[PDB]
Amino acid sequence: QRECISVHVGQAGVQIGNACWELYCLEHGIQPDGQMPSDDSFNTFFSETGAGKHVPRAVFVDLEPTVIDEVRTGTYRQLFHPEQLITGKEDAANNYARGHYTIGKELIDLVLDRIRKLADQCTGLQGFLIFHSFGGGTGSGFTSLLMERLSVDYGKKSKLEFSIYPAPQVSTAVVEPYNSILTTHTTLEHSDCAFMVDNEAIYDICRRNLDIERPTYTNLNRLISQIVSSITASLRFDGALNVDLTEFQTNLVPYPRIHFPLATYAPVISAEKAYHEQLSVAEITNACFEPANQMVKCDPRHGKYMACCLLYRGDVVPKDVNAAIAAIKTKRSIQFVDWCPTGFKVGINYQPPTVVPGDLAKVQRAVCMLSNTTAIAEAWARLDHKFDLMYAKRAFVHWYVGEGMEEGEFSEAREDMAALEKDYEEVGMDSVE
Amino acid sequence: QRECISVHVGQAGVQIGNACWELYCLEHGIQPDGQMPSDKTIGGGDDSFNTFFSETGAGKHVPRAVFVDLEPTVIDEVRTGTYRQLFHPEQLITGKEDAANNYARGHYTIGKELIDLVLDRIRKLADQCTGLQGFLIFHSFGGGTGSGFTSLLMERLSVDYGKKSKLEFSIYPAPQVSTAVVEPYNSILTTHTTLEHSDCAFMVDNEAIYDICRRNLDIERPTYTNLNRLISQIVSSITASLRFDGALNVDLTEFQTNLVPYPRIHFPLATYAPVISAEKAYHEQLSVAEITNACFEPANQMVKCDPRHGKYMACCLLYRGDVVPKDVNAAIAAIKTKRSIQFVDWCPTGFKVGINYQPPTVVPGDLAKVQRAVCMLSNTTAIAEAWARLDHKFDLMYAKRAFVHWYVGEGMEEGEFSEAREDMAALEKDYEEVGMDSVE
Amino acid sequence: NPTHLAQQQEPWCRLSSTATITSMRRDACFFDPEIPKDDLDFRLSALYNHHSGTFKNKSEILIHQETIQDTH
Amino acid sequence: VSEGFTVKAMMKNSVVRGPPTAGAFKERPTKPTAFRKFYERGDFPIALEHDSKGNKIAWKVEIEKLDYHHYLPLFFDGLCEMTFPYEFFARQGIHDMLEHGGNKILPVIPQLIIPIKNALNLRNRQVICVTLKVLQHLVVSAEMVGEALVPYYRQILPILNIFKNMNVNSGDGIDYSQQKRENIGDLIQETLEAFERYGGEDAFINIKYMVPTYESCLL
Amino acid sequence: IKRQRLPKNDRGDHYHWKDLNRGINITIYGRTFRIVNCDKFTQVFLESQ
Amino acid sequence: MREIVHLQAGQCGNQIGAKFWEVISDEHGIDPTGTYHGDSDLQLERINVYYNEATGGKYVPRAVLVDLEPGTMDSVRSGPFGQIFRPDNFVFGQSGAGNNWAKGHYTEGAELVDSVLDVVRKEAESCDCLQGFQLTHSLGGGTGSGMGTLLISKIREEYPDRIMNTFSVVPSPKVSDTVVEPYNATLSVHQLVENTDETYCIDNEALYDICFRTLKLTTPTYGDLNHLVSATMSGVTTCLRFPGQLNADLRKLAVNMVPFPRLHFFMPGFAPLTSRGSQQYRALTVPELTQQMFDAKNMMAACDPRHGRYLTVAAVFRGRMSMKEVDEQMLNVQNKNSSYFVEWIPNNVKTAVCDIPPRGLKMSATFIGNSTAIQELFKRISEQFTAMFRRKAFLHWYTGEGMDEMEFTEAESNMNDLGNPVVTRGAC
Amino acid sequence: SESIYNLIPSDWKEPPQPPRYISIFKATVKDDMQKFKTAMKTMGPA
Ligand SMILES: Nc1nc2c(ncn2[C@@H]2O[C@H](COP(=O)(O)OP(=O)(O)OP(=O)(O)O)[C@@H](O)[C@H]2O)c(=O)[nH]1
Ligand SMILES: Nc1nc2c(ncn2[C@@H]2O[C@H](COP(=O)(O)OP(=O)(O)OP(=O)(O)O)[C@@H](O)[C@H]2O)c(=O)[nH]1
Numbered sequence A: 001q002r003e004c005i006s007v008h009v010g011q012a013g014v015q016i017g018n019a020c021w022e023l024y025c026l027e028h029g030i031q032p033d034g035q036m037p038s039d040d041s042f043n044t045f046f047s048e049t050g051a052g053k054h055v056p057r058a059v060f061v062d063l064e065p066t067v068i069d070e071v072r073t074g075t076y077r078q079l080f081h082p083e084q085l086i087t088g089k090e091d092a093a094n095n096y097a098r099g100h101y102t103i104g105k106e107l108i109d110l111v112l113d114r115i116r117k118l119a120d121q122c123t124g125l126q127g128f129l130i131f132h133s134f135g136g137g138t139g140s141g142f143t144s145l146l147m148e149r150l151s152v153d154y155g156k157k158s159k160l161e162f163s164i165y166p167a168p169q170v171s172t173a174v175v176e177p178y179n180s181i182l183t184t185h186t187t188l189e190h191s192d193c194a195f196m197v198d199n200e201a202i203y204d205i206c207r208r209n210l211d212i213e214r215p216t217y218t219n220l221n222r223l224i225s226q227i228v229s230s231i232t233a234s235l236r237f238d239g240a241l242n243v244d245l246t247e248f249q250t251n252l253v254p255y256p257r258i259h260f261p262l263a264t265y266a267p268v269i270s271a272e273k274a275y276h277e278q279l280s281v282a283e284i285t286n287a288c289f290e291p292a293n294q295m296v297k298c299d300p301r302h303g304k305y306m307a308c309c310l311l312y313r314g315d316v317v318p319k320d321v322n323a324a325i326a327a328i329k330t331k332r333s334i335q336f337v338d339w340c341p342t343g344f345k346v347g348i349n350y351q352p353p354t355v356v357p358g359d360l361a362k363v364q365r366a367v368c369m370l371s372n373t374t375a376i377a378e379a380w381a382r383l384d385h386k387f388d389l390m391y392a393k394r395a396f397v398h399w400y401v402g403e404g405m406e407e408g409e410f411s412e413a414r415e416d417m418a419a420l421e422k423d424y425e426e427v428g429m430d431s432v433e
Numbered sequence B: 001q002r003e004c005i006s007v008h009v010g011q012a013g014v015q016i017g018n019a020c021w022e023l024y025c026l027e028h029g030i031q032p033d034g035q036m037p038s039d040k041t042i043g044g045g046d047d048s049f050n051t052f053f054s055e056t057g058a059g060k061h062v063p064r065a066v067f068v069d070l071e072p073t074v075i076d077e078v079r080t081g082t083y084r085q086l087f088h089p090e091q092l093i094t095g096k097e098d099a100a101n102n103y104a105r106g107h108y109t110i111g112k113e114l115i116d117l118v119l120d121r122i123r124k125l126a127d128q129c130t131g132l133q134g135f136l137i138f139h140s141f142g143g144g145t146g147s148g149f150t151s152l153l154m155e156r157l158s159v160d161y162g163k164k165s166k167l168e169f170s171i172y173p174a175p176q177v178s179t180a181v182v183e184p185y186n187s188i189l190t191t192h193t194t195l196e197h198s199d200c201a202f203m204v205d206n207e208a209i210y211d212i213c214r215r216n217l218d219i220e221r222p223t224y225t226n227l228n229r230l231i232s233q234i235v236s237s238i239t240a241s242l243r244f245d246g247a248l249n250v251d252l253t254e255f256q257t258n259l260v261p262y263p264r265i266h267f268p269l270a271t272y273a274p275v276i277s278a279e280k281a282y283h284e285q286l287s288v289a290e291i292t293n294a295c296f297e298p299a300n301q302m303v304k305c306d307p308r309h310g311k312y313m314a315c316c317l318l319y320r321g322d323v324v325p326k327d328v329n330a331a332i333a334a335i336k337t338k339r340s341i342q343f344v345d346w347c348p349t350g351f352k353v354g355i356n357y358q359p360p361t362v363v364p365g366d367l368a369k370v371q372r373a374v375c376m377l378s379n380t381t382a383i384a385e386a387w388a389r390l391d392h393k394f395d396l397m398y399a400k401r402a403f404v405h406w407y408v409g410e411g412m413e414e415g416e417f418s419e420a421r422e423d424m425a426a427l428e429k430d431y432e433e434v435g436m437d438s439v440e
Numbered sequence C: 001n002p003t004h005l006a007q008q009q010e011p012w013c014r015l016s017s018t019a020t021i022t023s024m025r026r027d028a029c030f031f032d033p034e035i036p037k038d039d040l041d042f043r044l045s046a047l048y049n050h051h052s053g054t055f056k057n058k059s060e061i062l063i064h065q066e067t068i069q070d071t072h
Numbered sequence D: 001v002s003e004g005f006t007v008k009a010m011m012k013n014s015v016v017r018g019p020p021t022a023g024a025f026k027e028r029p030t031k032p033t034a035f036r037k038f039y040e041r042g043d044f045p046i047a048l049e050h051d052s053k054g055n056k057i058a059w060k061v062e063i064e065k066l067d068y069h070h071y072l073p074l075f076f077d078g079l080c081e082m083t084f085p086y087e088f089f090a091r092q093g094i095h096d097m098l099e100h101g102g103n104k105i106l107p108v109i110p111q112l113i114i115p116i117k118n119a120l121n122l123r124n125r126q127v128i129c130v131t132l133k134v135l136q137h138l139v140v141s142a143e144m145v146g147e148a149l150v151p152y153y154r155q156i157l158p159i160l161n162i163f164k165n166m167n168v169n170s171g172d173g174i175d176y177s178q179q180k181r182e183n184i185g186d187l188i189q190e191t192l193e194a195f196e197r198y199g200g201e202d203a204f205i206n207i208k209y210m211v212p213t214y215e216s217c218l219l
Numbered sequence E: 001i002k003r004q005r006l007p008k009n010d011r012g013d014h015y016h017w018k019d020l021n022r023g024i025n026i027t028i029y030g031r032t033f034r035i036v037n038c039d040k041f042t043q044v045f046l047e048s049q
Numbered sequence F: 001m002r003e004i005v006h007l008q009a010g011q012c013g014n015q016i017g018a019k020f021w022e023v024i025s026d027e028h029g030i031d032p033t034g035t036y037h038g039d040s041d042l043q044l045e046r047i048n049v050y051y052n053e054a055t056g057g058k059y060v061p062r063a064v065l066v067d068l069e070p071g072t073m074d075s076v077r078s079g080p081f082g083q084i085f086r087p088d089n090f091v092f093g094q095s096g097a098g099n100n101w102a103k104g105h106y107t108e109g110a111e112l113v114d115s116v117l118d119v120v121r122k123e124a125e126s127c128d129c130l131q132g133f134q135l136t137h138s139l140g141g142g143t144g145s146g147m148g149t150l151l152i153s154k155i156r157e158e159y160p161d162r163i164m165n166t167f168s169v170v171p172s173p174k175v176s177d178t179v180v181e182p183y184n185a186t187l188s189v190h191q192l193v194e195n196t197d198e199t200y201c202i203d204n205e206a207l208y209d210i211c212f213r214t215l216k217l218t219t220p221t222y223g224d225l226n227h228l229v230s231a232t233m234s235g236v237t238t239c240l241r242f243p244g245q246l247n248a249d250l251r252k253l254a255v256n257m258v259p260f261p262r263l264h265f266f267m268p269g270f271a272p273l274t275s276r277g278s279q280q281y282r283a284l285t286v287p288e289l290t291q292q293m294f295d296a297k298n299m300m301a302a303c304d305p306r307h308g309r310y311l312t313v314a315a316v317f318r319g320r321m322s323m324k325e326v327d328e329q330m331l332n333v334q335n336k337n338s339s340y341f342v343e344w345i346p347n348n349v350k351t352a353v354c355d356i357p358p359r360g361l362k363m364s365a366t367f368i369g370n371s372t373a374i375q376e377l378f379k380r381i382s383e384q385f386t387a388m389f390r391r392k393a394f395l396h397w398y399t400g401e402g403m404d405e406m407e408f409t410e411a412e413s414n415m416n417d418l419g420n421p422v423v424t425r426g427a428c
Numbered sequence G: 001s002e003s004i005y006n007l008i009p010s011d012w013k014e015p016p017q018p019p020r021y022i023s024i025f026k027a028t029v030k031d032d033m034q035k036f037k038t039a040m041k042t043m044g045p046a
């Protein structure tokens, strides 16, 4: 009954998805043929048809072939019901005005129909989990499209969005800045909890904790996978202070607009190093507020924790957690806000972190801190500058105003992210009265 | 004990019957030699062969089929191929001159050299009968044989077997592609003359099965083999309740009584659920709610007319497999709460339910093994558009007397075209009259 | 009195007064014309005449008015 | 308050809720009769003569031979109406056409039952009064009319059963409305007396089958 | 006897194929059938299992 | 016969009730499958206080288990004494409370409360002479805070002359498992003020201090926390269930501990509690039990009673034990500590003495205190509420769910109204 | 009904839009952009 439906848009989505579904399978047990070698701990991500066919519950979507055709011809070929994987013919060519206008109004209908069939088999959809990549059309345009229509249809549900926000420096495209400022609405008005990640930081986590000096994308999307699992762990497996998707939101999203939380896993150590550490509840809790093990390039010592929700999993006994949370409240470098006294929603599941043939060591204790910091304005700003630097010379704008988007959009988009920064920037200041 | 006689008229009828009898022989369990397996069981073993087969008291299953055509190379295929020993040689009946897409060369001139002998074989097959459920004719509204000889056959059968049920399986012409130019002429004439002898006529168009095969069965290049196999699955789902045992067994007379509001209005739209394609089959539940909704979906209907552009009058569901009546009841309630499904205000109970415990049997081919299926036979007012389409086509051709001499110079009079066209106009006004709501 | 003079300052009463589209959706609203099922998604809005539309793919059977209608 | 037979019904001092009201002793919604339609078209050979001596329906054609088969059961459905320039027409058409008869009213008895039951179905007191005068005049009108209506006592009697005990309890004070014979309990009493009297050799079994309480006359 | 899972005991166990051999007594609904023979398909299936 | 309907609201209340039913089934002699394998006839004499009889000698507990999420109640079934409960009053729902008092009081809680009340009426008159109801719930969170108070209000409407006890787990300031605990706690205390007859406040850190220091446990678990609550629940309803003299029931305890109608927030304590290492160092006597009961660290509410005045104190002893030293200890503590007891109530300590001790124990005691130290708990919740509500933080969901802005202020008004008698009686 | 005092064309214009939020991070962002930049180091001069 506790079913959640995933929607992977874009190469980022399709790829991050393959990563998440190897874990979901390795977790519940569903092997790469649907069969579960030798109890309802699967209804969330897997829909079972008579005769263990544990079919998935997602809709991988890309406006170009390739990306998805690797899953259609890969090891997990006999799992994703052919239809679920929905593909087109031409990419949006990093043009939001292609995913949201031209090459995009051709797949929006079929995807929303597959999403219905999945959301018609569920007895209680608890929320939709999206995975885009502000940067391309199938990650900014088609998302906006899908989200704008999903909200109207599946209204009183949820839309926990996971995104790969442009980095503060590297980036991979010259039109990334534009697309992101343009996808602001999909994250501000048509979402419920936007967890934003950035490749640079997950790459720092890798070149520092896992000891991998040449991190690929695979390594990165596996880290995104363990973060998602921890969030959807108190719906499949069992625990003491279990917490659902609806609960996270309450003890996080403070005001309706303020809903851009940041994520940080805890024991991101590697086999060898994890022989010199005790990885106790305090080691993991402290190394989650650490201004480096964070997943977005943003020092939290520049903002005010508005509400951090900590989701543990494994040999965590309520007592240790309570003791640890207290230590954090002693350290005064981790200043909180003055309007959220009790600023911690603890959640404890049991299933210890599952390990895929890869890197992150097998541990008996982990945590994932979904926190709502005020230090996210720095990311908002880094991007604001890049957009403002190019929109002045109206560079790379012809492509957009030639696929539909009338200039007016860019301008509105700008104002939106502007107001957004005001909201955050001015919400941690102390009581003037 | 409850037998039906199948008559296949024309090339389309014979090929549809080839698919049908292939499905029957692999469904009941009968080897192509006409006999039974000796080192294999069957499918359970009963008198559940009698309706479509007759024992000669030696282990030989001879079927109750008459494959009539005025042209060879269509019956020669079934006398040469792998089913050459199943059919009795006098049952497969062949003329020597083609009907030439003419209703005249099937009804008026070249029908008389074969109609006596066809009725003689029909009389023999009706003599070997305990209780006759009825006849199942298979034809098209296209070619000359399938129009005219079907017409003459219904004229003779209404006299000889006037208290008996006769079900047409008619290939309705497509509104756009077609195959011949004289299809509107032949269709207007044959429905004019079979409109008072057909007790119930299931029309099945070719374009909609093409669409079903390309959109659900994933066949970018389907053919007549696939179309006739799916029509054969329809016919088996219709007359399987008198072959096996189910929760709500439903007969051909009950089909007629619950599907036809007024005696000229006997044209149900047939649709089938699981039209799925093996590698798309084992991933869904294929639950009873899904198979009930897929019938009322306006893309699985097999006549190119939108059910939204009309009003439902009486729909008959025929479920096969592990179907519990509570799921049928819940699906019917869910359909009836939907506003866009419009039933007529003079039919509160618009559903006729039949349930069978026998799962559908699969030929090696396109369709998949499913443990649930349903055939939906919807009598509705959406067919007025399909009648008026080729009515306008008839008007376009008849306004200049194009191709009319090929009918006129062979016994047929000029005024029969006007008679048939007016009876179509009367059918149109009858459909509108039965359709619109009650205010008195 | 301090609660009122504090609640109606500005930089948080604006945040409390404003609400996003999704937040507006989940405030016990009531939308009658919607899609409760795929049998409504295929049927209530399709813009595809089964009698007139010939030989269309799976993605062409369902073309919504909101799909061919301007944004927001 | 408790709705029904739930656990809330047995709650110490529990105020139980009553059942919904019943359609008996309550007015019914009227419908447009064919009387109005046929009159508005005007194939009727009738005209109100508007006499000062009381309203009379003047007849252009002879009453003794009009049809009594497409007219008399058609004038019977005018007993479902209250508007003045149709109610009088129905009243003095039906009474006059039952007065002038003989060997022509009798085959119409099976075709005049449905308008009688439809007249009785709507519970207006005045029209129930008027149709009770109609049934009394009909049973006293001709020969064997009651003997042909005795297989039909079982469907015009049940509404004639509902209002049987509706006499006025005026006490020693006298009722000053015996003229306009309106008291429908007394009218039902007289109608059943006329039915049993001019009904035939076997009518009390059907009558007692429909109306439960009845003391037999002509004993 | 119609096609349904034939009970074996009082507690409602259906007969399986693991206790269906040639030349055996099987009781059902009061009666006691004496299974004698089978065909080549049943033989090869039973020796295969 | 007098008998109590036991209701569990929320995950906290459900696990607390499960531990309670385990403990009292051990106390009475009822196995997991409902039959009785005991040793004395005194256990089945008053089995009709908590156990409804069924066919074949099966004693089904008179408990209604409620939660908006069917995930912890499945654990209640799968627990040790899980196949003893009736599955019909096992009332559930397929939703999520969201840690929302609004969603537990004016949304699916209000849709499921009728289904609760039907079975509640059913075992409320599978009855002869009902005494009261016993709700176990968490004061901060969903379900137990919201639907618990909704059930309290509807039950006080339906049966207004019956005793209502609520064992409430009140939020802690050392840590928090929920950020809207001030909202839920304030809104639930507002309903608790004018409704219930006996509230028993149990902070989590007080149980943590008892586990860490008094019992010297190394890994205290939520079951170990719940065991103390189960012990004090069995201690309170003991003279109502077992023979003896000075038999105090729920109404007698309410009379002798509630001087004014709004002052019924108690702070319970169970005190034959010692460690394994110091277990054999004891000289277990009535002075030792009085010593441990009035030591201000075994209290199960995080409220130091030396920071205020005792109004009333109840002591329910269990065991074969002489009355002279009982009365001597109760008199002696009052004479010794004269600045910690009010002077307008002479002899403000009650005495109840049951004979049958809890199994494994020979002489136990349950302490109940209506001290003025609860004002610290209430004003602390009020300070957190004013820190969160002054900014309208986390309020959009309540207001969009159906709360009003006025109702939070009115709940705060009655909440700090409650703090005023308990300080005027602290300073006369 | 209607009135004369509704044919009047109102002089209501949109009030001018407030200026955008300059942000308190813009100087840090610009300094970070100028940081790590050394012109003409690997490619070198022509
Ligand atoms: N984990 C992970 N992240 C990726 C992957 N591919 C791309 N990304 C991130 O996504 C950003 C842009 O890629 P996308 O938005 O997915 O491009 P797209 O959606 O395919 O859009 P088109 O190129 O127009 O088809 C890059 O900056 C990457 O940081 C991937 O395979 N795995
Ligand atoms: N479904 C299906 N339809 C067919 C098939 N063969 C022909 N048709 C349709 O039937 C129409 C004509 O078929 P027939 O009536 O059998 O042709 P005929 O009776 O041999 O007439 P002649 O052309 O004069 O020989 C064509 O327009 C086709 O659309 C078939 O194998 N399957």
Ligand SMILES: Nc1nc2c(ncn2[C@@H]2O[C@H](COP(=O)(O)OP(=O)(O)O)[C@@H](O)[C@H]2O)c(=O)[nH]1
Binding pocket: F009, F010, F011, F012, F013, F015, F016, F067, F097, F099, F138, F139, F140, F141, F142, F143, F144, F145, F169, F176, F177, F178, F204, F222, F223, F225, F226, F229
């Ligand atoms: N004594 C005791 N307290 C518990 C138990 N389980 C949870 N709690 C406490 O209950 C508090 C909140 O529970 P809550 O979320 O409101 O549960 P809910 O009522 O189902 O929503 C937590 O802070 C726990 O400390 C238990 O089993 N025993």
